[model samples]
Target: MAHHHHHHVDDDDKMEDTANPNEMTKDAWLNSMTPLLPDLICKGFIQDPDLKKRFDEIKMTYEQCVTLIPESTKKCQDELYASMPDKINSETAGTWGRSLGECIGKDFAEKHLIPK
Candidate 1:
């Protein structure tokens, strides 16, 4: 007689795996992260023409995104969170239609926006 050990996967485990940013594959990260990108741009999170192109054009590896994303998210949240209170009564408050989940990545650009 042979004995086999059976392992059961719980909901928590499933949730944890899905929620783990480090575990995000290329396709998964792109699908999840891209939607938040435009908000970041309009809100001035990513201001550099070159850097913006990287996000818009240059495709990066899964490892790159996983490594870069968490830090960028934290920084963007910190800046916007600190500024929101001051802007609440102002006309520019959320004027760009940005969400807390969107990020500009690192390196704020000093250049101005050009009209289309």
Candidate 2:
């Protein structure tokens, strides 16, 4: 008996369902970047300066987009991204770097750790 071959095709044409070609809003931009967080964390982009410099360059263009978001939202977003300094597992990395680029906007000399 000859071996059988099988192939599957998507019912819907994915190309026809493409998103708008217009510019993405601040929210969409922020949301779109969420998936990249794990790579940023796992690869030590935010934790290591050498990695971070390249990371910063990527974000340079998006700085204006960060301002488009509300200050309060940006503030919360920044703190949330920077919260895991010691080292965080990558399970939540995607959720974290959503605002990683946005966090660089505000001026804070250093992050403080509250002692027990």
Candidate 3:
């Protein structure tokens, strides 16, 4: 709904589907970086001296993605990944849609406690 001559109305009711070449689309960018997003979000970038220098390639720590995705439907998995010390803050828990809902023991269990 929009203000059409003082009254709120549906904008789509009179709008035409116009295409613009200047506008950047997400599909193009994501397609180009389909493989990189997983790495950047999980194992992090290879440029960091402390983290990247330890790994030969991003593929080595790629399993971190699925392990961190709570309520993940995909079950078939490979190597297990766990980041026990890297605690999940309230912000991250909200964003990722995860809580200590299924409580076990905070002192013993970890945040990224997915099985191998």
Candidate 4:
């Protein structure tokens, strides 16, 4: 009379595949700006027209990179990680900002800007 021992196993597949395909693009821009914003704001990068223009240009280039080479998102992160210093202090904030901007801008120029 062991026929009553049959157990019905109802396994639910709760795997989520709701990730955005454009997530990398957002990540690239955020990662690039996360470290730079605090220092930039402290040094008045936004207050200066030229500096603000350069900042906007970098952002625009990143968007272009996403449209032109969707795969270049990682490269954007690489450029920032390789160029940004381990620490940004008051004394070197301005210098670091300039160098970081140039470093990322050069990569954008090589990858997508100049080509367009």
Each prediction's Cα lDDT score? Answer: 0.42, 0.42, 0.32, 0.46
Task: State TM-scores per candidate.
Answer: 0.28, 0.26, 0.23, 0.32
Please list the residue runs of candidate 2 whose C-alpha ends up more than 4 Å from where it truly belongs after superposition: 1-19, 45-116
lDDT of 4 by residue, 30-66 (tens): 4555455434332343466765565465554333433
Instruction: Give residue 28's error in model 3 in angstroms.
Output: 0.4
Clashing pairs in 4: none
- Model 4, position 12, has a per-residue lDDT of 33
Q: Which ten residues in a row have the lowest lDDT in candidate 2?
A: 107-116
Candidate 1, position 98, lDDT:
46
Kindly provide the TM-score of model 4 when superposed on the true structure, using C-alpha atoms: 0.32
Model 1 per-residue lDDT tens digits across residues 37-69: 534444342365665554444443334444544
The deviation in Å at residue 67 for candidate 2 is 27
RMSD of 2: 15.9
Encode model 2's per-residue lDDT on 10-116: one tens digit a residue: 45465677665364433454455544433333344446686457546545323433333343344545466445444333444444554463353222112211111
Task: Identify the superior model by TM-score, candidate 3 or candidate 4.
Answer: 4
In model 1, the clashing pairs are: none
List the candidate numbers ranked by TM-score, top first: 4, 1, 2, 3
Candidate 1 Cα errors over 4 Å, as ranges: 1-59, 86-103, 106-116
- CA RMSD for every model? 14.6, 15.9, 12.8, 12.5
